[PDB]
Design a protein around this motif. Sequence first.
Motif, short mmCIF file in Angstrom:
data_model
loop_
_atom_site.label_atom_id
_atom_site.label_comp_id
_atom_site.label_asym_id
_atom_site.label_seq_id
_atom_site.Cartn_x
_atom_site.Cartn_y
_atom_site.Cartn_z
N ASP A 1 2.32 -2.15 9.62
CA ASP A 1 3.94 -2.30 10.20
C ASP A 1 4.49 -3.86 9.56
O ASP A 1 5.55 -3.78 9.46
CB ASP A 1 3.70 -2.67 11.71
CG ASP A 1 3.26 -1.63 12.68
OD1 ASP A 1 3.42 -0.41 11.92
OD2 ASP A 1 2.65 -1.68 13.66
N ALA A 2 3.63 -4.75 9.39
CA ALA A 2 3.92 -5.98 8.63
C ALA A 2 4.65 -5.64 7.27
O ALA A 2 5.71 -6.42 6.92
CB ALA A 2 2.86 -7.09 8.46
N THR B 1 -5.53 -13.11 8.20
CA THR B 1 -4.20 -13.30 8.53
C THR B 1 -3.13 -11.96 8.61
O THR B 1 -3.39 -11.34 7.78
CB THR B 1 -3.61 -14.10 7.52
OG1 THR B 1 -4.46 -15.33 7.06
CG2 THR B 1 -2.21 -14.29 7.58
N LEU B 2 -2.61 -12.02 9.65
CA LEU B 2 -1.63 -11.07 10.14
C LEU B 2 -0.15 -11.85 10.09
O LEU B 2 -0.13 -12.92 10.32
CB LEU B 2 -1.81 -10.70 11.55
CG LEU B 2 -3.14 -10.03 12.22
CD1 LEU B 2 -2.96 -9.72 13.52
CD2 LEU B 2 -3.04 -8.73 11.08
N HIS B 3 0.80 -11.22 9.68
CA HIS B 3 2.06 -11.70 9.65
C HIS B 3 3.00 -10.84 10.19
O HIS B 3 2.59 -9.73 10.46
CB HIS B 3 2.66 -12.04 8.05
CG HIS B 3 2.70 -10.76 7.25
ND1 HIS B 3 1.64 -10.10 6.72
CD2 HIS B 3 3.70 -10.41 6.57
CE1 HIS B 3 2.29 -8.94 6.03
NE2 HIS B 3 3.43 -9.31 5.89
N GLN B 4 4.40 -11.26 10.47
CA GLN B 4 5.60 -10.43 10.84
C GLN B 4 5.40 -10.42 12.19
O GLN B 4 4.73 -9.92 12.88
CB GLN B 4 5.59 -8.81 10.28
CG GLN B 4 6.44 -8.84 9.03
CD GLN B 4 7.64 -9.24 8.82
OE1 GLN B 4 8.46 -9.04 10.10
NE2 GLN B 4 8.36 -9.49 7.66
N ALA C 1 5.24 -7.09 14.28
CA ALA C 1 3.97 -6.35 13.97
C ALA C 1 2.89 -6.91 14.68
O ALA C 1 2.01 -6.04 15.39
CB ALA C 1 3.68 -6.44 12.43
N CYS D 1 -1.64 -3.03 12.00
CA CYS D 1 -0.80 -4.30 11.84
C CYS D 1 -0.55 -4.76 10.79
O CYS D 1 0.76 -4.85 10.27
CB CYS D 1 -1.43 -5.44 12.71
SG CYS D 1 -0.25 -7.01 12.86
N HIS D 2 -1.37 -4.35 9.65
CA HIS D 2 -0.95 -4.65 8.15
C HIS D 2 0.04 -3.90 7.78
O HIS D 2 1.13 -4.02 7.14
CB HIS D 2 -2.04 -4.56 7.44
CG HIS D 2 -3.30 -5.75 7.63
ND1 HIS D 2 -2.87 -6.92 7.93
CD2 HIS D 2 -4.53 -5.68 7.74
CE1 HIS D 2 -4.16 -7.52 7.99
NE2 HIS D 2 -5.00 -7.15 7.75
N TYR E 1 -0.68 -9.36 -2.96
CA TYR E 1 -1.30 -8.60 -1.66
C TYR E 1 -1.78 -7.50 -2.19
O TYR E 1 -3.24 -7.06 -1.61
CB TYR E 1 -0.04 -8.26 -0.75
CG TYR E 1 -0.54 -7.75 0.58
CD1 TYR E 1 -0.64 -8.66 1.51
CD2 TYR E 1 -0.57 -6.40 0.78
CE1 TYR E 1 -1.22 -8.32 2.65
CE2 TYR E 1 -1.07 -6.06 1.97
CZ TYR E 1 -1.37 -6.94 2.98
OH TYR E 1 -1.88 -6.42 4.18
N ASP F 1 4.79 -11.66 -4.64
CA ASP F 1 3.73 -11.46 -3.23
C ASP F 1 3.09 -10.42 -3.03
O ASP F 1 1.87 -10.17 -2.76
CB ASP F 1 4.67 -12.05 -2.13
CG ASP F 1 5.07 -13.51 -1.89
OD1 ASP F 1 4.28 -14.23 -2.78
OD2 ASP F 1 6.07 -13.69 -1.55
N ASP G 1 7.80 -3.99 7.70
CA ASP G 1 8.89 -4.91 8.17
C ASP G 1 9.06 -6.06 6.98
O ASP G 1 10.38 -6.51 6.97
CB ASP G 1 8.46 -5.74 9.40
CG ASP G 1 8.95 -5.05 10.73
OD1 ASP G 1 8.55 -5.39 11.70
OD2 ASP G 1 9.18 -3.96 10.55
N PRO H 1 0.99 -14.91 3.15
CA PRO H 1 0.97 -13.65 2.12
C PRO H 1 2.40 -13.57 1.57
O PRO H 1 2.42 -13.07 0.48
CB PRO H 1 0.52 -12.74 3.14
CG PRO H 1 0.96 -13.10 4.58
CD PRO H 1 0.74 -14.68 4.34
N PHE H 2 3.58 -13.72 2.39
CA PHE H 2 4.78 -13.45 1.89
C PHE H 2 5.73 -14.67 2.08
O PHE H 2 6.91 -14.47 2.27
CB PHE H 2 5.32 -12.28 2.62
CG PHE H 2 4.64 -10.95 2.01
CD1 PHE H 2 3.39 -10.55 2.87
CD2 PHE H 2 5.02 -10.33 0.92
CE1 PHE H 2 2.93 -9.53 2.41
CE2 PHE H 2 4.25 -9.15 0.50
CZ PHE H 2 3.23 -8.72 1.23
N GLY H 3 5.05 -15.80 2.20
CA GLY H 3 5.81 -17.20 2.21
C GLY H 3 6.79 -17.34 3.55
O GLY H 3 7.51 -18.11 3.47
#
Lengths: 198, 198
Positions: free
Chosen positions: A88-89, B59-62, B65, A85-86, A133, A129, A92, B46-48
């Motif tokens: 893919d994120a 934390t997962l984002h997007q 994703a 997932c990380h 990260y 960012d 994206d 993580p990316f605002g």
Amino acid sequence: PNYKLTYFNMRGRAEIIRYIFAYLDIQYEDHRIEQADWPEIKSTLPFGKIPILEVDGLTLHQSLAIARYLTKNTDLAGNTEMEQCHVDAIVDTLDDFMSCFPWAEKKQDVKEQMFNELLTYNAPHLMQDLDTYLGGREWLIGMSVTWADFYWEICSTTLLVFKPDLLDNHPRLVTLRKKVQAIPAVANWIKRRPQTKL
Amino acid sequence: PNYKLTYFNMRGRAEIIRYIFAYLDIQYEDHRIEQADWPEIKSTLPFGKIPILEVDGLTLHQSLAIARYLTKNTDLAGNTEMEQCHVDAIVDTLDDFMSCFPWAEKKQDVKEQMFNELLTYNAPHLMQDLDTYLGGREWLIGMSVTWADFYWEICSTTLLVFKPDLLDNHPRLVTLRKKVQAIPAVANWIKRRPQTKL
Ligand SMILES: N[C@@H](CCC(=O)N[C@@H](CS)C(=O)NCC(=O)O)C(=O)O
Ligand SMILES: N[C@@H](CCC(=O)N[C@@H](CS)C(=O)NCC(=O)O)C(=O)O
Ligand SMILES: [Ca+2]
């Protein structure tokens, strides 16, 4: 499998697929069309966009969907579902930013206004960012290279064309770029691929 | 695991995640922040950007994703690697169009104009491609519902707010919406979720 990648003659959105093929040592037809023959080809595609990838006679579209398809079950995908997932994120987030640029805008003043705005204000924030990260780790996700690292190197290459000092405050992001370019299979591709601006 | 979804009080980009949780009957904290909360919340992203989904402290984002992560190993993912790629492709094609809209444009006049132009001059082509792609099949991919169907219903719901006649020429795409809205778990969520414009 018999692979045929179709895209314009540039790295663009097809490059991530080309890196994956190189890294995995997979032979494929790197079909690059000329703008003149696009109108015809476009009309035969379900969604009229490129790149597209033909796999054993079956057509797939959307560069990142294709990239994910090719990296599944390989060491480039992420070691766990969460890490996948990380990956893919990150991809994206990068795609989101690159997509903000008006690549097809004919209005030069409108195009240059947005490019300068994105590069001057937005880019620095993204670089910060990403750097945070990454931290002091070798790769963006996990302890080994993933296609997210590939995408970083690919996207940053194009950004550097318009903003050479993009990474002057981020040596760690520069090193990541070099780490990817140093991978034997990737270095070989970079050395033989057609030299295009984008 | 413990789940905490953070987003604004609207369907927007978090809705696809909310549909998946509803469909899979998975409990989660649906945290909706106020604009006044933004400065503090953003400092933790993580990316605002939101949404983000916290899973057992990480934390997962997007949104997409995360959606892909949540549907892995479930009946919503796609039955084959090829179909999983098609699901990804359709979702990205929809996401690409939704991203064309100037959601954050301050000047209402210019915003309205661009919205109207996009829905009148561009949307029709995408609607036709989707209709053609769907053909007479029950769902977009495979023989059962996938999150790509969820995403269609979600995106079209928002588009219909600004272009009511969007689907007048495509009854088959309307039927697809109804089928998704008819799924018990989804129907229940649609009925109970906070009513917001977007
Ligand atoms: N998000 C899609 C982008 C598809 C896209 O817009 N492709 C462009 C080339 S970069 C193209 O097909 N443009 C020609 C046209 O739209 O007629 C992907 O990653 O494949
Ligand atoms: N492609 C990303 C988009 C993330 C995004 O742009 N989210 C918006 C809210 S819909 C946001 O956080 N915007 C804050 C900002 O732009 O500073 C996703 O699907 O999560
Ligand atoms: Ca995208």
